[PDB]
Design a protein around this nucleic acid. Structure first.
Length: 44
RNA sequence: UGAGGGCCUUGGUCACGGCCUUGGCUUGCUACAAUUAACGAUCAACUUAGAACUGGUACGGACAAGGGGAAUCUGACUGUUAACGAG
């Protein structure tokens, strides 16, 4: 399982597509520990 | 073939006109046709109902209330990155 943090931007969907290519299920989330103001998103 | 009318006429009768008698168009009864009168004639009845000029239709061409898009956290919670909330 690959768990990474991505800064949301215009190049965020391409990473998701590549992960879907290499992984059977790809899903992103934002844990409450990460501050809401931050643009980071944790995708597994 | 019988009746009634019209024009004739013959004698007697009463002062051209009456009275009494003499012989030659309508209808009645019989005989043969017609019965597609399924025709014709006449008297009486009869006048032209139409108004109004409303819209929705499918089509062809511009407006229509108004800054949009995606994903996560979250709240009540089905059969696909489900959906829903003017969070």
């Amino acid at each position: 399982t690959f768990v990474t943090k991505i800064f949301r931007s215009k190049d965020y969907n391409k990473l998701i597509w590549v992960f879907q290519q290499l992984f059977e299920k790809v899903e992103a989330t934002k844990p409450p520990a990460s501050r809401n103001v931050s643009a980071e998103i944790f995708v597994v």
